[PDB]
Amino acid sequence: SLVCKNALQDLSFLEHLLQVKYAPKTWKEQYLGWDLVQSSVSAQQKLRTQENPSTSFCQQVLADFIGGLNDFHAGVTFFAIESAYLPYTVQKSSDGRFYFVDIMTFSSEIRVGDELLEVDGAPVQDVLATLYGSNHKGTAAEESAALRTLFSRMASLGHKVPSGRTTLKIRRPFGTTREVRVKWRYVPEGSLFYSPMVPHFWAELRNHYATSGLKSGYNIGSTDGFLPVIGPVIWESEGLFRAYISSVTDGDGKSHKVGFLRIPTYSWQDMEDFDPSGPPPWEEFAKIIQVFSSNTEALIIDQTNNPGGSVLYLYALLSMLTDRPLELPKHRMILTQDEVVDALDWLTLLENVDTNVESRLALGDNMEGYTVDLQVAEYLKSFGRQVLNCWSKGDIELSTPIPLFGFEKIHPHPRVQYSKPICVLINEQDFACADFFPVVLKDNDRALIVGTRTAGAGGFVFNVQFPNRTGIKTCSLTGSLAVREHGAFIENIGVEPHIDLPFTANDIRYKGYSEYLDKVKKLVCQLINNDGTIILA
C-alpha cells in the first residue's frame, strides 16, 4: 500500500525523535521496561499486517507507539477534524461506581446522580479498558484519562471516532434499571525553554471544549472548581479567580475564618475571562492574598484539575505563598543548537548588571509574576553558563542536573506573603506545573497536600513539528527530568498527598462533596490550632 510505506516512513522518524530528543529515555528504559526498538517493530507488524490500511488507522498505529512511553508529556497530534462527542460527564467513586456529575443541557431522559452501568450491553469497566493505552499500569491517573475520553473522541489524537445510536444502562437512585438510546454529536472529516509545560493532550482538548458546548467546571482548568462552597461565605471576590472566605466551626463550636482559593491553570493568558490590556492574573492573585494576609487564619487551595502552564508564573505564585525561601529541585535536560542560543542572549543581555536596579531595568520589573532582583539576573547568568557547561562535553544526552533557569530557590514576594497555614487540594488530573506546585510546597513542609496522587511530574516539553506524509501535525516529547541526590528520581511520578483521600460515592451521588470537605475542614482546623496534623480523624 502507498500509505503503509509513508506510514512506515514517518514512523522511522518518530523512532529517531525518541533517541535524539526525549530526556526520560534512559529512565523509561527501566521502570516500565519499554524498549523503543522492539516497540518500533510491533509498529511495523501492525502496519504491514493490516489489509488495505486506512490513513486514520496508521495515525492511530503511530499515536499508540509514542503514547506507550506512558508519558503524558509525549504523544502525537494530526491535522484532523473528525470527532465524536456526547453531552455528558461522569466521575468514578471510591468503591468504584460511575455517576453522572453533569449533563450539558440537552435535557434528555438522563439526569444527574444516575449510576452508569453499561454501554451497548457492556459494563463501563470493560468499555473503558478498550480505551486504555499500551503499557497500561492500572493507576488512578490513567483510569481517569480513559473515562475522560469516554464521551469525547478526537481523531486529532488518533482516537477511534464512533457514531450512531448507543445504549446507556443507567441505574436510577432507587435500585431500578433503565436503558437509554442516544446519538453521538459527530463531525465529518473534511524555543526549548520558553515552551509551556502541559501535556499535548490539552492543546486539542482545550480547543475541543470551547468548540463544543461542554463548558462545565468538571473539565481541566476550570476557573471555578466543582467543589461546592465550604460553608457560609463571609467574603468573596468578583474577579478573575474563584476566591472567598468562610467561617468553619471545629469540634467545639469555635469559629474560624478559612480562606478558599483555586488556581486552575498555570498558563495564565488562557484564564477564562482574561482581558489582555488590563492587569495580569498574577497581580490580582496578590490581591486575593493581601486580603487573606489579615482577614483569615488558614488557607485551603484547590488545585485539582490543573493542566500545567508557565514554569515562572507557578514560581511567581509560590513567591507570595511563603515568608521564607523554598527548595527547588534540579532537572537533567537535553540541549540543541538553540537553547544554547537562548542562553547566549541571557548572558549578553545582562552581562554588565551589578545593581538591583539594572537588574529590574534589563529583565523588566517582573518575570511573569515573579519579581526581578539582582539575585535573579544572577540566577540567569549562572543558568546561561551551565547550559554551555553541558553543551561542549558530549553529554547532551542528559546534561548534568540543572535548576530550571537560574532559580535554586523561591524568594518571598517583597510585597505580599501568606505567613499562615496552607492546605492544597490535588487529584489524578494535575499535570506538569500542577505537580511542581504541591510538590515544592510539600518538599519544604509549607502545605498539607490532601486528595489523590498527581498525574505525573513536570519538565519542558519538545514540540517537534516535522514534514510528513501522514497527518502528524506535531510530536511533543519530554525534554527534562527531575533528579534527586545526584539522580534517578522516581518510582511513581507523582506527588503523594500527606492524607490519601478519594471521593466517596456518598459525596458524588448528590454533588454535595459533603464528606470530602468535612475531612478537609477538620484537617485545616487541627492546623489552625498550632501546626502538624497528628492523626487522621
From Swiss-Prot:
Belongs to the chlamydial CPn_1016/CT_858/TC_0248 family. It comes from Chlamydia trachomatis serovar D (strain ATCC VR-885 / DSM 19411 / UW-3/Cx). NCBIfam families: chlamy_CPAF. GO terms for biological process: proteolysis; signal transduction. InterPro entries: ClpP/crotonase-like_dom_sf, CPAF_PDZ, PDZ_sf, Tail-specific_protease. One of its GO terms (cellular component) is outer membrane-bounded periplasmic space. The lineage of its organism: Bacteria, Pseudomonadati, Chlamydiota, Chlamydiia, Chlamydiales. GO terms for molecular function: endopeptidase activity; serine-type peptidase activity. This is Protein CT_858. Gene3D superfamilies: 2-enoyl-CoA Hydratase, Chain A, domain 1 (3.90.226.10), 2.30.42.10. It comes from the Bacteria. Disulfide bonds: none annotated.
